[PDB]
């Protein structure tokens, strides 16, 4: 094959970040699950391997590599990298040892590269052993020269890393040299030149470590050439010129719900390819008030005729789940119904069954969960771009200002956000208060700044609805936004005074993950 | 003096401010009838402010017959806020809708002829118009400042009643009569905000006084102590601040659990009793596993409280076996003896530090009643209680230390059950205003962030925790 980098995830929830800079760097990414057999590697050229973990390994049974994999992985000319847990695993699967760290603090952490001269810049050797001479612990560990291959043009000697470790390594597997010191985690990363292994227990997977993107860049670029990779944007584009050559002879489907992923795909897939594609809209029974129509309206306005269907179907769903507490059950159910309604909708036009390519609202990540722990050859358009990049694409299309700032919707919609009997009247009421809250919220401009806001419900039995808000750095991180009291007293008062049926409002504060992104 | 109850919260703060001066009181609902008055007297009458607009239903229907008798009585009258609106209506005049109204911070102006010439605020009073009451005899200061709460702009007055004042965007805001010394006040003098309001009550009050509270209770207590047949403790010292105070004075001159409470706070609690009670009894009945039981799937509300209640009548008897003002006020207008009533909590607070009490006699959240029945989600089990007690305490822990805790009038936590295992919570914060209202105060964000992170980190069984954002009214303070 012509493939290039492999990135095993042992629960590394910054996996996204690894892929992103791998890409932003103009570079190829590839994915897998850790307990990845070498059964699915393909004899495919791979000049780099990257392992990452950040889920301890001091408790029997924690995840890590398999020997066949590691040894093959080692080879001689094909590099290895390890990171956080990856390093530990790297370390322990070959003569190293590990022990729980003590009170790790992480954070944007300035950190320091380490050469002998830096043996003494360290101004933090007092801890984790003896005396003062900076030189003693250093004398103890291996070391070397200033210029490191994986470090070039840093401008500043100090390296910052935003990092997390609740576990640290205590012995140097094999024979490689020391390249980093941490206040409460002393050895840090150690770089091996014959096993081409370079373990960082910090997280170069961030933007909180710019010198960090640099390290990543450098690593591919240097340890392994990765001479020519593949550019992602260009990808939606070539799948595209390639499809423009045959617009007329080929049919296409869209899966629209107003989701930005969606409108964008269609539109970029609409030009020079106009009369053959049927976007179909399935009501979920759970929308933001008149969201169904607002959504259809936007679509018509964006573009006039692309064979737009509209299928309303609420009661089947409500009936379908008259009073069920299962949650996963709810997902199963909704999925099933959209799949069915979608099948019937598509089939309300009885023709060209297997000459159509469904489109879906899919970027990089969903495609990514594809590997974690009728049917037509598919054609999901966006398989390599990030919500943010797609967001810049939404302006690139010059679509409206309003859509890019969309709180993506869950899918099950209000059902999950509705935690109780699910039915047409109560639910109508909260689609409604959700509206009161969102309008006031957006009235002061927090919409563009509130990553994600959704009144969510609680069946107190009159009724109390709880309001949720989240700052989204990304997919696995969810910090919760605060809203000033002025705005809040009013919003809150407005709702109780205005919507009949609620006696108490709570506001949810729980942070980060905790990713109760929606309650159920 | 008679007070008429129409429901404004300030309606009891009304009585508290009035109480300072030699004063006096009796209680009744809107229809105080006449069988409720005899060989009875007062020289003035205090109307009760309500949120019910008269040209609107629910306006309490004052008994007109009684009103007639009230005039017949031959005594000066005082009508406040709405008492004014209802009163205007018994009379020929009547109101109208809010004149670009509001409440409070508004600063009333006074009037007369010199002062009449003096109003530069009659503009916008109909397309475009231009220009020493018993009530303000000594502020004299010619003006008025106060907390105002009128939804009900009174636009046209009764009969033969000139005005002691007018105001910015509220026109009529004082009515002075000589017919019956009547006065109607649209602004709320019955508040603390009304410094000039203080004298309204005092002067109208004196003018209506042709005794002092502490004075009277100190007296009754000693007399009660005159015979000194006292071996009868007045009541169990559950620890209530009012309790410790009363118990202390009395027991000092002269020679209870389970239901709830937080944790070691509990141990600390009888422990407290002991340090406090050097030589007094600290009875206890640590046994409440029965009723908790009786709480293993049953959630009837009047009943959950009634239950804890007979539960309590129960404890009185079992222990028996081995051997303040506002509350009363709410009960009256609404439809071994209490040692005394001529006092409120603020004053008893001063009494504690006037009697050299330990600190922390003031910054304590007495969730009277269910010690904690209300926070039951429905089912009652030891797991929840302990978890909850722990979280409540983590909750008051942080505020005690950060310094806002004594900042807050009442703080605790409620245990929600609709959150792999899970249950979840609410954090209650209420900077009260009154007995008939409470307003919740924001707790700051960085500090709040940490309190939450600390609770998030201490246990499991609480999946997501949620702050509570509800001011009374609309809905009440204790969540269940």
Residue numbers in the entry:
A (entry chain A): 5 to 59, 61 to 378, 398 to 485, 497 to 555
B (entry chain B): 9 to 139, 152 to 230, 235 to 279, 287 to 354, 368 to 379, 402 to 485, 495 to 555
Direct quotes from the study:
GMP synthesis proceeds through two steps, the first being the conversion of IMP to xanthine monophosphate (XMP) catalysed by IMP dehydrogenase followed by GMPS (guanosine 5′-monophosphate synthetase; EC 6.3.5.2) converting XMP to GMP4. GMPS is a class-I (trpG-type) amidotransferase in which the catalytic reaction occurs in two physically distant domains, a GATase (glutamine amidotransferase) domain and an ATPPase (ATP pyrophosphatase) domain5. Hydrolysis of glutamine to glutamate and ammonia occurs in the GATase domain, whereas formation of the intermediate AMP-XMP from ATP and XMP occurs in the ATPPase domain. Ammonia generated in the GATase domain attacks the intermediate to generate GMP.
We purified and crystallized PfGMPS, PfGMPS_C89A and PfGATase, and solved their structures by molecular replacement to resolutions of 3.6, 3.15 and 2.6 Å, respectively. The 108 C-terminal residues of the ATPPase domain are involved in dimerization. Interestingly, the nucleotide-binding site of PfGMPS comprises residues from two adjacent monomers, strongly suggesting that the dimer is essential for enzymatic activity. Small angle X-ray scattering (SAXS) confirmed the dimeric structure of PfGMPS in solution corresponding to the active form of the enzyme, as seen from the good fit of the dimer crystal structure superimposed onto the calculated 17 Å resolution PfGMPS SAXS envelope. Upon superposition of the PfGMPS- (conformational state I) and PfGMPS_C89A/Gln (conformational state II) dimer structures, the two ATPPase domains remain invariant, whereas the two GATase domains differ by an 85° rotation and a 3 Å translation when going from states I to II. Probably binding of ATP and XMP by changing the conformation of helix 371–375 could be responsible for the interface rearrangement. It also seems plausible that the charge-mediated interaction between Glu374 and His20, along with the hydrophobic interface contributes to stabilize PfGMPS in the conformation observed for ligand-free and XMP-bound enzymes. His20 (in close vicinity of Glu374 in the apo PfGMPS structure) was mutated to Ala, giving a 23% drop in leaky activity. As the structure of PfGMPS shows inter-domain interaction via Glu374 and His20, the rate of adenyl-XMP formation in PfGMPS_H20A upon mixing the enzyme with ATP and XMP was measured. A progress curve with a single slope and an apparent rate constant of 96±6 min−1 was obtained, and the 1.6-fold drop of the rate constant validates the inter-domain interaction seen in the structure.
